[PDB]
């Protein structure tokens, strides 16, 4: 059996992440979305909000579950007994921080594989930072994110 | 007529920008330098100062106008009725980012073209960030910027 | 004689820099590890702590000495009378930033050469930032740093 763990800040989750999750839920028996606290990033949404938004966006996929965590990813992946890390690779960078992330996690969790997917072309170039900045200036982001996310961002900047 | 809009933070405008603007005024009938507030960047100079510096550096160019804006670029370009985005490309450098930026603005402003110029060999490798940091440590920055900008940098840290 | 200066924040110094330093001490008569204050990065360790960790890690190399500084690199290098800048490329970070750095320093210190080494494959993916983050979450970092650094990181986070 394969259990893949998709770790990220998801602030917020976008159509880019969702495409990747869609594809991964058809490949693997179990997909865990691991939302990291990432306090250093000063996230726009709270961990609970990010987990909840990610849950809403994935509610239709039976083998996908969402959980938040504040610990070391290499510890958390053993705790989840997942044998595969999922990360998305868009163009291009980083990427190289992803190569660096994978090689450092290989030392800390040797039995976990690091694997990459690339999003549909249509949802590449979608970045959570840019979704946030467009929303904060009142731009329409409905083509970059799910409607609950769009609503959450709109209400957030009021 | 083409009305080209060149949007940046310009903190401060450098000889790299100035080169691009010289080149852009020779290609297009109307060039608007759109100086972004960019509060996330915590600019060294105020928007009002950054606009005054850009005005000073381009006042000799009759088809070039400068304005500050704090709104969504995709909204502001319509209020300005420009049909072309100008951006500069240097060493890699923030080049992925220009594709992603262009991609997302093509969704938000479908009718506006996105185009790129490159500055002379001589003004590549000039970053407004390194100019700020060198000046803040009392390094001589006069060879990276126009003289009014050099004075403002000197006065900025006294 | 060649006197090479190796500047960085070294927060903290890793086996990644130590490999570069080892290689440099066998090429040059004199190697200076220049630790930058870098107040903006808000370093985990104080300047004085980072200088001490760097001394501990290199004290077995007689031609290598460590010093801290808070001034402009281009002036400090004149103070140390070094004619060579050493910079490492922690794999493929942004050699374009190192270029922008080198050519701007070419303007401020024309008599100093910029030179680059790459670390052994084994240490080319160690990031002091990620070491700080793994250590802060109680992860084992003994495979990325010298034992004094591991001890120092351990004491820093309980
Ligand atoms: C060696 C190690 O163990 S690392 C030690 C430090 N920390 C930890 O262990 C705690 C765990 N931390 C994490 O899991 C984090 O998710 C990290 C460190 C893996 C990566 O940070 P992320 O949350 O993925 O955000 P990311 O680095 O991708 O930057 C956010 C951007 O990437 C996108 N993004 C966010 N999360 C992801 C993701 N999981 N996968 C792909 N893309 C993502 C967003 O669209 C966003 O767009 P932007 O570039 O304009 O901002
Ligand atoms: C979807 C989107 O378009 S964003 C939606 C939300 N935000 C907005 O709408 C705000 C609208 N304004 C903007 O987004 C800003 O103008 C931006 C990001 C397009 C431009 O910001 P920038 O000026 O490029 O800041 P940035 O630091 O990234 O500049 C990169 C480098 O190129 C130089 N530079 C500054 N402005 C420009 C410019 N317009 N073009 C080319 N180079 C520039 C600088 O010297 C800078 O050097 P540095 O990185 O060492 O500081
Ligand atoms: C040089 C000029 O005058 S331009 C103005 C800039 N600054 C000054 O004048 C003051 C002097 N400042 C310095 O010397 C600084 O060290 C700098 C800006 C030149 C370099 O900063 P860095 O120490 O490389 O820090 P960086 O932002 O890359 O982050 C530290 C990382 O760099 C790595 N690192 C630090 N120094 C080096 C180095 N000399 N070579 C290769 N890698 C390095 C570490 O692996 C660490 O890993 P990380 O990216 O995961 O955190």
Cα–Cα distance list, A19 to A16, A22, A97, B107, C67 (Å)? 5, 5, 22, 18, 51
Cβ-Cβ contacts under 8 Å between A and B: the total is 31
For the record, the structure tokens of B40 come out as 């996330």
| Residue B134, C-beta contacts closer than 8 angstroms, at least 6 positions apart | B140, B141, B144, C72, C74, C104, C108
Active site residues of C: 17, 41, 90, 128
d(CA A108, CA A95): 20
CB-CB neighbors (< 8 A) of B79 in chain A: none
CB-CB neighbors (< 8 A) of A154 in chain B: none
Residue of C nearest to A70 (CA): C137
Residue A5's nearest CA partner among A101, A92, A115 is A115
Order of all β-strands in the sheet with B84-88: B64-69, B30-36, B3-8, B84-88, B113-117
| Residue B131, C-beta contacts closer than 8 angstroms, at least 6 positions apart | B12, B14, B141, B144, B145, B153
Method of determination? X-ray
For the record, the structure tokens of A15 come out as 């159509």
User: For the range C76-79, what are the long-range contacts, defined as Cβ-Cβ under 8 Å and sequence gap of 24 or more?
Assistant: C76/C34, C77/C5, C77/C34, C77/C109, C77/C112, C78/C109
Cα–chain center distance at B127: 11
Give the domain ranges of chain C: 1-158
By residue count, chain A amounts to 158
Residue B75's nearest CA partner among B7, B17, B24 is B7
Tell the residue nearest (CA) to atom 38 of ligand 2: B8
- Whether residue A90 contacts residue A119, with contact meaning beta carbons closer than 8 Å, is answered with yes
Residues B18-48 as b/e (b if ≥16 CB within 10 A, e otherwise) read: bbbbbbbbeebebbbbbbbeeeeeebbbebe
Residue of C nearest to B91 (CA): C96
The CATH homologous superfamily to which domain B1-158 belongs is: HUPs (3.40.50.620)
Cα–Cα distance list, B137 to A77, B107, B154, C49 (Å)? 45, 42, 11, 23
Burial tier of A52 (Cβ tally within 10 Å: 0-12, 13-18, 19+): middle
Contact assignment for B138 to C72 by CB distance below 8 Å? yes
Scan for tokens 């100079």, then name that residue: B45
Residue A152's nearest CA partner among A122, A137, A125, A132 is A132
Contact assignment for A137 to B103 by CB distance below 8 Å? no
Tell the residue nearest (CA) to atom 14 of ligand 2: B73
d(CA A97, CA A105): 12
Cα–chain center distance at C82: 16
Cα–chain center distance at B45: 14
Between strands B64-69 and B30-36, the pairing is parallel
B23 is annotated as an active-site residue: no
A134 touches chain B (CB under 8 A): yes
d(CA B15, CA C21): 37
Residue A53's nearest CA partner among A134, A131, A137, A158 is A131
Which residue of the set A17, A30, A50, A146 is catalytic? A17
Contact assignment for B103 to A91 by CB distance below 8 Å? no
B90 is annotated as an active-site residue: yes
d(CA B51, CA B68): 6
Q: How far is B103 from chain A (nearest CA, A)?
A: 7
d(CA A37, CA A135): 22
A134 touches chain C (CB under 8 A): no
Residue of C nearest to B124 (CA): C100
d(CA A141, CA A149): 9
Cα–chain center distance at C63: 16
d(CA B70, CA B76): 9
């Amino acid at each position: 059996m394969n259990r893949v763990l998709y770790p990220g800040t998801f602030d917020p989750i976008t159509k880019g992440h969702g495409d990747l999750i869609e594809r991964a839920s058809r490949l693997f028996d179990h997909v865990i979305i691991a939302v990291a606290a990432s306090p250093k990033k000063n996230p726009l949404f709270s961990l609970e909000q990010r987990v909840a938004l990610a849950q809403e966006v994935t509610k239709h996929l039976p083998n996908v579950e969402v959980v938040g965590f504040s610990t070391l990813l290499a510890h958390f992946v053993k705790e989840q007994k997942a044998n595969v890390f999922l990360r998305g690779l868009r163009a291009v960078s980083d990427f190289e921080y992803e190569f660096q992330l994978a090689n450092m996690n290989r030392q800390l969790a040797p039995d976990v594989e690091s694997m990459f997917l690339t999003p549909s072309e249509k949802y590449s170039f979608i970045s959570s930072t840019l979704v946030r900045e467009i929303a904060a200036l009142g731009g329409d982001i409905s083509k970059f994110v799910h409607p609950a996310v769009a609503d959450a961002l709109a209400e957030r900047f009021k």
